[PDB]
Amino acid sequence: KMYGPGGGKYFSTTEDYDHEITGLRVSVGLLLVKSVQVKLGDSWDVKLGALGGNTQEVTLQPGEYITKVFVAFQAFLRGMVMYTSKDRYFYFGKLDGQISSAYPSQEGQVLVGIYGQYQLLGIKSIGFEWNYP
């Protein structure tokens, strides 16, 4: 469920039937992952987290799901790696701090949301919602 030292303002991505995560954007400053943003179908969901940084955009091909995520913390979320069902990885930031593994406890489940806590400087805490397409 919830990774990091935490404390902050709670966020969670919009979770929808009829619409899945088709893409994603993570904002990274010089060091910290500031904010995340999922595209749900043909529309970017609200952008959640600290302001600022450079935003990496990543686009899932149809039928491609996020199935696992590594996350590194250091007072603030430094880095995140997402692996998909098409043998594709997406690196954001640098994996340095305390690495942690998020995966579904069940088979064929895939990333449906992201949630956590953030403050002014970036994200203090992150977690992932798994579920069938």
CATH number at residue 1: 2.100.10.30
Task: Give the distance between the most distant pair of CA atoms in the chain.
Answer: 37
User: Which residue range(s) make up the domain with 44?
Assistant: 1-133
Q: How far apart are CA 77 and CA 80, in angstroms?
A: 8
Q: Per the structure block, which two tokens stand in for 26?
A: 């993570």
Could you tell me which residues are beta bridge partners of residue 60?
Answer: none
Cα gap 131→46, rounded to integer Å? 21
Whether residue 44 contacts residue 19, with contact meaning beta carbons closer than 8 Å, is answered with no
Q: What is the DSSP letter of 19?
A: -
Question: Is 67 within 8 Å of 104 (Cβ atoms)?
Answer: yes
How far is it, in rounded angstroms, from Cα 59 to Cα 73?
25
Q: Which residues pair with 108 in a beta bridge?
A: none
Q: In what order do the strands lie in the sheet with 48-49?
A: 48-49, 33-40, 21-28, 54-59
Element at 118 (helix H, strand E): strand 110-119
Q: How far apart are alpha carbons 31 and 121 in whole angstroms?
A: 10
Please state the domain count of the chain: 1
- Whether the CB-CB separation of 6 and 125 falls below 8 Å is answered with yes
In 3D space, the residue among 23, 19, 25 whose CA is nearest the CA of residue 92 turns out to be 25
Q: Report the alpha-carbon distance of residue 5 to residue 65 in Å, rounded.
A: 28
Task: Single out the residue of 101, 116, 110, 123 nearest to residue 2, CA to CA.
Answer: 116
